[PDB]
């Protein structure tokens, strides 16, 4: 089988701008093992039939895992705009994989405030699909070459989510795993009954 008890239950989910890409191959990929996740979790996918993904198979399964708040889990989809889908993690419009997201208020929220999860806020452009940026160069919009220090229009691009248990469903930490299947000229070796 694929290891799905090594992606969905990892103790270390990275922040969104540094999403961890994990290649899974040589399997019998059973997606009926995901019943014992969180009581409500969004299993929506595109380009494959969700009643037939256990019989159609692929050369590789790329799983990307990150943590975002609930207000912006909508942007984890092709053809979406926002902070995440433009500046942090963009899905291509030719997407052939599945987007899985569940609430993680138990694991990722401290009463003092969980500051370990950061998102990119200003980056002077957009992101091409499946491209990350771990760059921490100081953002430049004003007409000052003062990059060593903060200024009027010079900001540090990464900002913190500040997860707390006193916040709405839009601000609760939603751990996201996006499987990204690909079909190529190689033999598949992922499918099985």
């Amino acid at each position: 089988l694929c290891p799905f008890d090594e992606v969905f239950n990892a103790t270390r989910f990275a922040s969104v701008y540094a999403w961890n890409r994990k290649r899974i191959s040589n399997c019998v990929a059973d997606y009926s093992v995901l019943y014992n996740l969180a009581p409500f979790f969004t299993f929506k996918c595109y380009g494959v039939s969700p009643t037939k993904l256990n019989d159609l198979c692929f050369t590789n399964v790329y799983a990307d895992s990150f943590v975002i708040r609930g207000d912006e889990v909508r942007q984890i989809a092709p053809g979406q705009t926002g902070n995440i889908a433009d500046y942090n993690y963009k899905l291509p419009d030719d997407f052939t994989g599945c987007v899985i997201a569940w609430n993680s208020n138990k694991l990722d929220s401290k009463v003092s405030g969980n500051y370990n999860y950061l998102y990119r806020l200003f980056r002077k452009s957009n992101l091409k699909p499946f491209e990350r940026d771990i760059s921490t160069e100081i953002y430049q919009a004003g007409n000052k070459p003062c990059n060593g220090v903060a200024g009027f229009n010079c900001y540090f691009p990464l900002r913190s989510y500040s997860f707390r248990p006193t916040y709405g469903v839009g601000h609760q930490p939603y751990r996201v795993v996006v499987l990204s299947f690909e079909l190529l000229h190689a033999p598949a070796t992922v499918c099985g009954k």
Epitope: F40, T42, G70, R74, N103, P165, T166, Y167, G168
Partner: antibody
Amino acid sequence: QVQLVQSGAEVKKPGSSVKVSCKASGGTFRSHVISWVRQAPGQGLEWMGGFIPLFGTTIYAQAFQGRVMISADESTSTAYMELSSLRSEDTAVYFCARLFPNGDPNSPEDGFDIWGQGTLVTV
Amino acid sequence: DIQMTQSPSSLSASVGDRVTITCQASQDIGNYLNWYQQKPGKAPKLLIYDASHLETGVPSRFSGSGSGTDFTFTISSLQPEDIATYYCQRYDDLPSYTFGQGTKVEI
């Protein structure tokens, strides 16, 4: 400055259905779950149901399971509770509420818990 | 389902006294309890969240306690503006809440 406002007091007759609205004041209707609480005029509060605007799923109380229907209009920030089959026992002040975890980091001056003003439904 | 029996439902105390309100759940819920205050004719207000903390703007006379099933609402010194009804509410991670029978505090 989020201020939940409602429709108004509706007198009814038994057997009919009532739909009561709750228009939130602000652009952050999608973030917070909105939930409906009824209070009988002498008794304590009772939870009815809730609508999560993130995914559209609903959670209903097991005493009002199959009787109530909660939907929303996200383009105008208004959540509708469609109570059906009114009876003599269903005479209550119906609050719309953003029960406790609906605070936000932006503008902490509004508290974690935000309630409505109450709709008096009389049969 | 979880039903929670809050007692006493009707007490009475003078000004400057100590008021203790007890909310007992039917099974283990952890710190998931919030304490409300409904003055008559108005919407309820939140005082204690997660059974111990304090809402911003609420004076420090109120203080909750308890974790397992036996919780406890305490008012330090009673005031004329605390004549109301107090409800204990059972928050869950899936948003399902259960209120209490209420405790009417009379001067």
